């Protein structure tokens, strides 16, 4: 480790008696600080993505507060600083855009400003990831305090989870089967705590990735939001950064690709969002860790998911929580070969360390090898001439049978062709039809949006038939089902060859021999790719321009191409 | 009601430009506020018991913030004044000693500055009751906003309420059967959100009466702390509170001796907290309803236990609130001609058109009223030589064959006393005594502890017996079993009978005849208690000293005699 | 000092494995607290005074902020109390008869809960003496942070006290001289910044008599309410009191005879409010010292006001503050044989030793010996038949040819009295007459008011005549000028001899001799007393009829007579 006492960054801005230090210094002494605070102790920046409009982060200022009593209990300096907060359930046309303009922003707010070390307050979706990539180009040390779950919803004395009965209950305000004073009660009991999506969606997944990850302090990805040991958790937190920062503990030094395959081994265990594996390549794409969709297979395979918990299961995070959340499935992975026991974490333990003694407290809902809902849970990764730079499923959520199924294309050329036929009963349409969606990725939705999961055609649901093969270079939400193959890259609106699927084309897919194949000639493959034009609106001003000239496909994480890799934090010129 | 516009009492303070107003006017304008804030509109005191030391009422300044935002709603001016909170988790000897020293700045807070109405921020046991008594004493329109109780405990995956396993988790840290960093997660688990006790306590009992009495929104009593739907409640009870004093509908319309008897029966339906009764005697003084112990014994008849909670039952407040909470309740009292329907509420409207229309959404919680838990489970009052001026008793909690039961005394002169002599093995006592404990009323102990649930001695217990009868001028926990006799009137301490109890001295006990009776002659009584000298400590100053010559019996509320009744709210000589 | 480690007194609540102390440890750990925060480590009750409707204290909240950081930072558990807050400008009949009331509340809010030490955060009037009443009845380590004054007021480009143009802009906004667009600009210029008022007041007093008796940080009473530095002491303050616990450096240790001695002549120094006569009379007789309104008159001897601040001058606070405040004031008492230089303050430092090496920065505010405004500007204990115990004057806001000075009495029965005939043109008065007011002291206004400084008849002022003689038993605002003599002891409502003053009564003040004689004979004064009878309104019940049984005269400080003395910190007995 490093040597303490030693002269930290801030000191460029704090530290001395020349006239640069004492306008920044005195500056900042507005706000009514103790002189000794700039000392050369840690100066810790609190990145906050708390809003008013991210209501899944909405308790993030009263964890603010925890953290900074940990840091000044240890010593440090605490600052809070806001940042960038993309919400999946209030930003259009997707928070997925928004998530590097978050991670830019971070970096930047990072580098330029004196602070030692980082606390990543985050909860929503994209916040967990924004602010790992920003802080991972800095490398500065840096720990994740994860905002939570909800509780479970109760309306009418059943568990509801969160986005689960949409259908229900939109079903029934139309269809009279219930009053509006009626649906107002039930939209109240879905959403009832601050917190995020309870069920294993993006966040739950992306909180568990964190702490997989040793980047959390361990129990971090599953108390409630609303749970006072959160709040232990935020002030033990804010009085680790600080010894980290005298240690210099630095993500470089955690998120190691031994780390990186503890999380995707996890993320099989937990039976995770497929979010997780544009995130974790996003996030290995700063840090400078050679991460690939390949990784993602092979270290996928095998890995029975344990955790019983919708989409995939029957309960929500709550009682993942009770039965000792994540420690208790890191274990368990130690216990069989799977993890690296040796990864060190952000508390200066090994992850083997930090889990090895947890009590299973549940076993319906951390399920033993035997009672598990897959043996092989883990995120495949399809190639095929179809996907030349590969395409995902979660085979947990598939149908058997259609694993291995080939049959004849019905294309939609977009997300609007999509819902102007679904529902048109004179579409050409049966159960062994492969439905395919273009222009849905990155650069072409655009921000690669949640509609990989489409819906069925109601004529083939009459028939009481719940699934069909469905491809789109879309992403889908953490909660889904159905037999989807999602991330299709090269996207369509980047020329791949899913832009040049045509109706009643022949498609094979092929789960146990990883193949996805568009069954023509390579020459028609060839003529149809040369005669290509991008058909999507392109923007000409704005984040918009800047995102569809920039952004990546979803095989390498969907990052913008010059914001990949550390710039490290060294102290900028000097503002006079 | 009364004309709207009108000259309210805060513009004694607000209104005009004699020097007078503008010294007031101008002194608040230092805060920053609009001018037109001081034309007359309603001015909100948000009375606030929220401190760091009473941890149940830990979210209350959240709370505030969305009664405040109603207020700025609904047009009128909202000013948060902090009031005493005595909480029953910190306060020694015991914060029923401190009720009447809340209720009176309570009382003084708000007749003494301009506020032309009241919200009552509560929560601990002890703060709805004191806000309630000192509200009633001024007469300005007041609402209660109740702060909800903790979610449910679970340690280990089984449900664990608060208060409950404080046996099992210290006796097994001293006999060694969990280490010591296992303790540390057991006690981190009992009480795990911010809020108030989650069995039907003292809390629960309370929020309970404020909603039977119409003094809180429909639905207030059982939201726990920390739901989404308490913040929403709040900010509705800020809102409601200016057209309340608009209307002025105060405390004295709401609380007539009908409610009070609405409050009663939902007390029974509830198998609520002894200390209710204590309680409501106080409140109705201030009021000026004529309530004595004997209503609560005519009105407890005859009313099934309904709601399966423990200390009586199974389940905690998070359930209650599932599957309806208290309007469910009201609904079924309305049912079954024990509710007085045409009650006035807060709202403006009856309790019954409040409630008439809700669903019971859990009946193991819930009970239909085949399947109660008692069919008669409100208090009754024994009467008797030895309870000259009444004592108190919860059959529901109580043992059978007990009821009717006849025996020997074994005393205990103090409460020092009992604990010296209880667990001796040398102590002379079987399981058909009687235990008897004296000095540990209000003015005894002093304040009237929660020390009437008296441990059996452990000679007793090794036979398997769980129960025994016992006497004392002391309060019981809401949480509690057994055959127990509480605020045995007039108290040991101001020369009572059960002052001049000897051991050996045959006791009977007969519920059904309401009779508690010391088996000795009238003479022999007579000249024990002429004889009789007031050996406890007697305080020279402080407020000890206040509360000794001024504090009153459990049967009429345990209330200070010089504060009994309603002062109004005229406004007082002007400060220059 | 005392031994550390050592158990403090919070751990009779958080220290072990018994029951009681899992009840009370695991209740406070629902706001989510670590586990070693209740290790013993000093728990700091930060006493908070802020309220919305207390603007002199609006912003405390953000002091309380900084205070936690401290406590944070020197390892100790920093807890936020409101406390009863009795500001002046909101409370009638007068915030004065509120001061014990929150004494009594301040002091059971600290005995009865785990607070090892005690910050006072304070502001308003009688905030700064009722908790260090309450405190002082304690004897834990306690030490002040006080507010700060308001901004000066600036209306139309000239300076404006605090209360000070009351009279033009009510004057001028009924004589037409201004608009009602022009009077709003005016208020809204007075008071335009968080804190207290600007001039020598009852405010600026109470927190320099803080400072001199050592009871706060150095250069604590100054600062303005606004001021970065008032946060940064909040935090060193913080800090402190954590060693402070450690150390046992408790009130009695601080506030020894000569600590209000220093304070005695720190009042004469600044032209400090008489309303500090009474209150260091009540905190002296909670810590036990004995001092007497004698001991004000011979220490306010031969001292010169020295801080050129209205009333009695031509600045305000800010102007104090910038060059040097109180320090500088209490070097030069130390220049001069007047300041106990070896008394023991909080910061552990001697006073001398704190003050000595501070540099006068504005010799136009504070003046330097040759230009003093009065030589002997302490306060003066006039004694006689018509003050059998003591009445007071500030010469140096008196008029020299007043100071000896005979006349006839014009009598005013009480408030309502004086209002009625003041202005009417047909009473008999000229400006050798003596104003004398009765039943205006703590019993008979009731609250002893600030109404001593009675304003004179309007055809007296006619001649440009601007002072007469006025006797009272009222108090008066720090903000006055005139000869008037106050605190009139035994008062009017309580048989002392200004109740039988009749008109054309012969009256002879002589303040140069400390006299003040009605000079009729003792057998007709004996005469006038038998007869006497209390016509005030005598309240029945509430906190009135407590305060007219137990308030004492304004000659001993006023406090209720059960309330004097110190009643230590012993833990009570256990709750259950
Ligand atoms: S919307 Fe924020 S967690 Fe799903
Ligand atoms: S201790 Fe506050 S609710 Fe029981
Ligand atoms: S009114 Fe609070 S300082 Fe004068
Ligand atoms: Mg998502
Ligand atoms: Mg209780
Ligand atoms: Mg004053």
């Not at 489409?454 to 038939?465: C, E, H, N, Q, S």
Request: with cysteine; net charge negative; glycine share 10%.
């Amino acid at each position: 480790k490093a040597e303490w006492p030693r002269k930290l960054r801030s000191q460029e801005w704090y530290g001395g008696t020349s006239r640069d230090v004492i306008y920044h210094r005195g500056w900042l002494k507005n706000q009514g600080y103790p002189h000794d605070l700039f000392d050369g102790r840690p100066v810790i920046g609190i990145l906050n993505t708390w809003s008013d409009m991210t209501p899944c982060n909405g308790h993030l200022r009263e964890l603010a507060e925890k953290v900074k009593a940990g840091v000044w209990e240890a010593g440090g300096f605490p600052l809070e600083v806001p940042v960038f907060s993309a919400s999946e359930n209030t930003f259009r046309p997707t928070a997925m855009m928004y998530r590097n303009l978050a991670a830019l922003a971070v970096e930047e707010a990072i580098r330029g400003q004196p602070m030692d070390g980082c606390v990543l307050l985050v909860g929503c979706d994209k916040t967990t990831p924004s602010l790992l990539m920003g802080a991972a180009s800095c490398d500065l040390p840096s720990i994740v305090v994860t905002g939570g779950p909800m509780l479970n919803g109760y309306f009418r004395g059943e568990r509801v989870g969160s986005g689960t009965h949409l259908w229900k209950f939109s079903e029934m305000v139309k269809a009279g089967e219930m009053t509006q004073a009626e649906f107002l009660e039930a939209e109240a009991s879905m959403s009832r705590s601050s917190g995020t999506c309870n069920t294993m969606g993006t966040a739950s997944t992306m909180a568990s990735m964190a702490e997989a990850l040793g980047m959390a302090l361990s129990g971090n990805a599953a108390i409630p939001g609303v749970d006072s040991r959160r709040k232990v958790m935020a002030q033990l937190t804010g009085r680790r950064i600080v010894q980290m920062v005298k240690d210099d503990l630095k993500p470089s030094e955690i998120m190691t690709k031994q780390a990186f395959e503890n999380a995707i081994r996890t993320n099989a265990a937990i039976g995770g969002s497929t979010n997780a594996v544009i995130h974790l390549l996003a996030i290995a794409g700063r840090v400078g860790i050679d991460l690939s969709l390949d990784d993602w297979d092979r270290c996928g395979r095998d890995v029975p998911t344990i955790v019983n918990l919708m989409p995939s299961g029957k309960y929500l995070m709550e009682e993942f929580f009770y039965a000792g959340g994540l420690p208790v499935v890191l274990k368990r992975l130690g216990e069989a070969g799977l993890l690296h026991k040796d990864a060190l974490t952000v508390s200066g333990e090994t992850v083997w360390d930090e889990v090895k003694d947890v009590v299973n407290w549940n076993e319906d809902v951390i399920l033993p090898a035997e009672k598990a809902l897959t043996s092989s849970g883990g995120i495949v990764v399809l190639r095929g001439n179809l996907a030349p730079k590969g395409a995902v499923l979660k085979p947990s959520a598939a149908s058997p049978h259609l694993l291995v199924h080939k049959g004849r294309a019905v294309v939609f050329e977009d997300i609007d062709d999509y819902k102007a036929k679904i529902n048109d009963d004179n579409l050409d349409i049966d159960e062994n039809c492969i439905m395919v969606m273009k222009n849905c990725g990155p650069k072409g939705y655009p921000g690669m949006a949640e509609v990989g999961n489409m819906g069925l055609p109601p004529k083939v649901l009459k028939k009481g038939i719940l699934d069909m093969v469905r491809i789109s270079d879309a992403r889908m939400a953490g909660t889904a089902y159905g037999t989807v193959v999602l991330h299709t890259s090269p996207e369509a609106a980047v020329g791949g060859p899913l832009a040049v699927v045509k109706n009643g084309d022949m498609i094979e897919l092929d789960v146990p021999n990883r193949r996805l194949h568009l069954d023509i000639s390579d020459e028609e493959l060839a003529r149809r790719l040369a005669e290509w034009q991008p058909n999507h609106d392109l923007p000409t001003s704005g984040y918009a321009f800047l995102h569809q000239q920039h952004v990546e496909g979803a095989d390498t994480g969907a990052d913008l191409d010059f914001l990949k890799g550390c710039r490290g934090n060294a102290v900028g010129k000097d503002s006079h």
